[PDB]
Scaffold this active site. Structure first.
Site, PDB file in Angstrom:
ATOM      1  N   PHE A 289       0.836  -1.210   0.000  1.00 46.20           N
ATOM      2  CA  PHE A 289       0.000   0.000   0.000  1.00 46.20           C
ATOM      3  C   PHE A 289       0.871   1.260   0.000  1.00 46.20           C
ATOM      4  O   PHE A 289       2.046   1.217  -0.382  1.00 46.20           O
ATOM      5  CB  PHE A 289      -0.995   0.023   1.174  1.00 46.20           C
ATOM      6  CG  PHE A 289      -0.361   0.289   2.518  1.00 46.20           C
ATOM      7  CD1 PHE A 289      -0.185   1.591   2.971  1.00 46.20           C
ATOM      8  CD2 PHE A 289       0.040  -0.765   3.335  1.00 46.20           C
ATOM      9  CE1 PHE A 289       0.389   1.839   4.207  1.00 46.20           C
ATOM     10  CE2 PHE A 289       0.616  -0.527   4.571  1.00 46.20           C
ATOM     11  CZ  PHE A 289       0.792   0.778   5.009  1.00 46.20           C
TER      12      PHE A 289
ATOM     13  N   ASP B  78      -0.940 -10.321 -15.388  1.00 43.43           N
ATOM     14  CA  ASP B  78       0.092 -11.223 -14.903  1.00 43.43           C
ATOM     15  C   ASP B  78      -0.588 -12.481 -14.379  1.00 43.43           C
ATOM     16  O   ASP B  78      -1.136 -12.494 -13.279  1.00 43.43           O
ATOM     17  CB  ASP B  78       0.912 -10.530 -13.805  1.00 43.43           C
ATOM     18  CG  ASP B  78       2.064 -11.365 -13.318  1.00 43.43           C
ATOM     19  OD1 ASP B  78       2.071 -12.578 -13.595  1.00 43.43           O
ATOM     20  OD2 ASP B  78       2.963 -10.805 -12.655  1.00 43.43           O
TER      21      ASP B  78
ATOM     22  N   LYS C  42       5.417 -20.627 -14.333  1.00 43.06           N
ATOM     23  CA  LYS C  42       5.267 -21.654 -13.307  1.00 43.06           C
ATOM     24  C   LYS C  42       4.625 -22.924 -13.854  1.00 43.06           C
ATOM     25  O   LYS C  42       5.302 -23.724 -14.513  1.00 43.06           O
ATOM     26  CB  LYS C  42       4.489 -21.093 -12.117  1.00 43.06           C
ATOM     27  CG  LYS C  42       5.374 -20.246 -11.229  1.00 43.06           C
ATOM     28  CD  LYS C  42       4.598 -19.412 -10.236  1.00 43.06           C
ATOM     29  CE  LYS C  42       5.525 -18.859  -9.142  1.00 43.06           C
ATOM     30  NZ  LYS C  42       6.812 -18.322  -9.681  1.00 43.06           N
TER      31      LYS C  42
END
Lengths: 393, 381
Positions: free
Chosen positions: A140, A212, A241
């Site tokens: 944040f 993504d 991955k």
């Protein structure tokens, strides 16, 4: 030799650049892993989504061997038969003109930044001196923000259309790169309506919408692309991955010709990127995903698992929240009361291994071939391990 | 489907980010590769040194399969049996306290920069946000001429330098060999100014020049070693940094994040790849056949109008042309035609780096191909 022999060996011969949970694995099969002393654990990290298909899946290993007998690498100095087959496979499967194959997910992100900036020059007329890519606050003012004196990345709040639109107004933005669900931020799910809004907003300000999907894609949340859930089609997709079922480092960028063709040749990447061996493995890994209907398994078992777990922990003093979508789940604790790392050691003791993120949120991401029964057994382990700590305040 | 079919396919489905020689390979064995139409070529690039052991070496493939049946990846969230065995193997083998395993060679270089900078603060005690690193031609980097001790020393005087990172022989610059005396001087100089001497042996290492480390040639021991490519016999992306404790311990847990780095599958492949390198005495083969090949080639091309120079050490060789007279790219196409494939570098220098298991006879056949190719461009000028 014991788990400990190994752990000490590593400490004395390898760099101390990682801080692993103290378990030493020698074997994986599907949803289980086995340590030096032949103890069995549910793998709830899946090597951070690299083994969605499950550990040491035989079909994939097969694909790997068939290719490795013929040719493992020749480099991008020349062509291989295998790469094209992969490229054509992936493009048809995801609905994009072209694909660019690489090794690590970082290579994917780097390459994506280059891509967005160049598209921003070549098409949108923005100067590379001034191009900016918007990202989100994985967590944040005084700051040169004008012309060539610009940040490269502009951070904005996740799930925030008002803030997003405010930045999109900058004529020098070329791209918004965003995760369909924030992994590193502790598995943060967006409101159904965010991505639809994102797509519009980008369409309108003429800015590349890049998703993504390195963690969220390939079955993890129930669909091949998590963004499929929100009925939006991003300009660019990042995959990785699970793209290999853990048998090789493989990652990719997908885009249509108007974006991908901005990339000029001669620019070097990695030697191993797009090698025949990976290309073969990639096609099989995704074929397994589709044939065994692992996306649907994930979709079906996921929402239940999460709901039922929300129920059984509703009265816990240490649990803050239980989040997820599909089999991409997490539990956030109140690190005021508990040490998250110990919770992980306790899990390990109770037969389920996983890792922390923030020292407050624990990752729950098993391989996608897990059964309803297995998830139930794990809910037990989870409720039990959390009990252990609740029983100390 | 034919070569062409295959190439057009790539063009339409993959990004145009590379510019390959127009040959489409389906198979490799040792020193040979084979195209769609079953033509055979001598591979003289070795995938840029990734297949020093030779294409598709069976022992390595074996190691790979034994491991892949047990466990392929678990992530650095946990430990594997295989990684430690690798770490211990490499460390003993090269004479360094510790090793850090990774995937790509770029990961090795990035990580090296982080390492040097951090050592430069937690040890040399350099001012925060200011650690410069020197590198050779070809924001906090300082370029200096290769093979230049005077220039090197001048930069070492900067108290904010923490490291010199240098290749034992410059690959990208067109196979540039240093004078015997350079590295000895380098080692002294660095020792004196208290600066990390880092050797990038990603291309030069593991047998390519005759030794396990090209730096072994010059009897110097670098503070940090970068290894890659041939570290796997082309069966996986694997790379490493080697260093002793005083340098390595600078690095602390949990700051990084490539999932595949140090995975059990790579760890197993690594050990076998190097075992193959040593058992088959591929370093020595390279050492023995190399200097000859280079000398003999220097002879047979001494009277060429288009050749500028022939350089090398071990089986890391090159021929630089006068790009004023010839198009280097066409020379590469001609080679391909004559049965030997390789690539350009600078549009003036051509790489000659066969797998290390090549035989004296094979090298001789290749010399023929090379001379034949060259003459074709001589006559036609």
């Amino acid at each position: 030799k014991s788990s400990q022999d190994y752990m000490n060996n590593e400490l004395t011969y390898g760099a101390h650049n990682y801080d692993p949970i103290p378990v030493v694995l020698k074997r994986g099969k599907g949803v289980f892993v086995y340590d030096i002393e032949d103890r069995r654990y549910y793998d709830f990290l899946s090597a951070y989504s690299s083994v969605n298909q499950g550990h040491c899946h035989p079909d994939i290993l097969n694909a790997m061997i068939n290719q490795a007998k013929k040719l493992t690498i020749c480099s991008r100095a020349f062509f291989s038969d295998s790469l094209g087959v992969c490229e054509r496979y992936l493009t048809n499967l995801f609905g994009y003109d072209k694909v660019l194959m690489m090794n690590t997910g970082a290579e994917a992100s780097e390459t994506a930044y280059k891509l967005c900036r160049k598209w921003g020059y070549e098409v949108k007329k923005i100067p590379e001196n001034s191009a900016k890519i918007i990202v989100c606050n994985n967590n944040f003012k005084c700051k040169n923000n004008f012309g060539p004196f610009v940040p490269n990345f502009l951070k904005v709040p996740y799930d925030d259309l008002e803030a997003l639109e405010k930045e999109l107004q900058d004529p020098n933005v070329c791209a918004f790169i965003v995760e369909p669900v924030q992994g590193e931020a502790g598995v943060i799910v967006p409101s159904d309506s965010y991505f639809p809004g994102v797509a519009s907003l980008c369409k309108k300000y003429n800015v590349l919408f890049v998703a993504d999907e390195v963690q969220t894609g390939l079955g993890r949340t129930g669909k091949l692309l998590c963004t499929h859930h929100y009925g939006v089609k991003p300009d660019v997709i990042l995959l990785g991955k699970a793209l290999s079922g853990g048998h090789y480092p493989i990652s990719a960028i997908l885009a249509n010709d108007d974006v991908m063709l901005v990339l000029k040749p001669g620019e070097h990447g990695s030697t191993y990127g797009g090698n025949p061996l990976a290309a073969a493995i990639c096609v099989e890994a995704l074929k397994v995903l589709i044939n065994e209907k692992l996306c649907e398994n994930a979709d079906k078992l996921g929402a239940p698992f999460l709901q039922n777990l929300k129920e059984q922990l509703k009265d816990s003093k240490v649990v803050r929240e239980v989040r997820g979508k599909g089999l991409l789940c997490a539990i956030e604790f109140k690190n005021d009361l508990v040490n998250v790392w110990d919770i992980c050691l306790k899990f390990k003791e109770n037969g389920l291994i996983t890792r922390s993120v923030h020292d407050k949120t624990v990752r729950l991401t098993p391989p996608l071939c897990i059964t309803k029964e297995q998830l139930d057994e794990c809910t037990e382990i989870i409720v039990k391990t959390v009990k252990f700590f609740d029983d100390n305040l």
